[PDB]
Design a protein around this ligand. Structure first.
Ligand SMILES: C[C@H](NC(=O)[C@@H](N)Cc1ccccc1)C(=O)O
Ligand SMILES: [Mg+2]
Ligand code: NI
Length: 75
């Protein structure tokens, strides 16, 4: 299994990131906000998990929204 990681960046608005997580993944507002704050406070956070092919899509969707996203195998 793989995971998609979003990395903190100095340009994107906190409010925008919360919205992007809801729009792209259907997450609730408390869930999206929690992930956004984890990124901002820890520098990164797993935002989704699944097969390598599934995470490839999530990364591409996040890049199109302007967020710093990568994927890696889950240990
Ligand atoms: C402009 C400022 N944005 C931020 O401080 C960034 N770092 C917030 C963020 C959170 C998660 C991922 C990427 C960026 C703001 O006032 O919102
Ligand atoms: Mg980012
Ligand atoms: Ni910040």
């Amino acid at each position: 299994p793989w995971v998609t990681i979003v990395w903190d960046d100095p340009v994107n608005l906190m409010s925008y990131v919360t919205y992007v997580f809801q729009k792209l993944f259907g997450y609730s507002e408390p869930h999206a906000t929690k992930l956004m704050l984890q990124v901002h406070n820890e520098g990164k956070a797993v935002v989704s998990a699944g097969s390598r092919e599934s995470m490839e899509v999530d990364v591409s969707k996040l890049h199109a929204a302007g967020l710093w996203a990568t994927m890696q195998q889950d240990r």
